[PDB]
Amino acid sequence: GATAKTINDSVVTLIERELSGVKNLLYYSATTDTSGTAEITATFKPGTD
Amino acid sequence: NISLKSKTNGSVIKLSDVANVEIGSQAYNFAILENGKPATAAAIQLSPG
């Protein structure tokens, strides 16, 4: 029931704050649209389990 | 200007009547003295490994 900005400010930033401490990470990204859901992706170096 | 309803007489009162409204701090449990002069600071702790 919320717009993209609310989820980005309340949820996306908070979650993405904790993905900087993961190992073997290559990059991370986050996306939120006018659908009530937010998707964060963490991509690691090839060959990681 | 938030309005409450007095039970004693039914008169309308404002929030300032029974309270003081101010822009303060979330908590007052920590302080930082740098070289003997007030300041602010944060501590950084490493991730495992």
Automatic annotation (TrEMBL), chain B:
Report which superkingdom the organism of origin falls in: Bacteria
Where found in the cell?
Answer: Cell inner membrane
Family membership noted in the UniProt record: Belongs to the resistance-nodulation-cell division (RND) (TC 2.A.6) family.
Q: What is this protein called?
A: Efflux pump membrane transporter
Organism for this UniProt entry: Acinetobacter baumannii
What gene makes this protein?
adeB
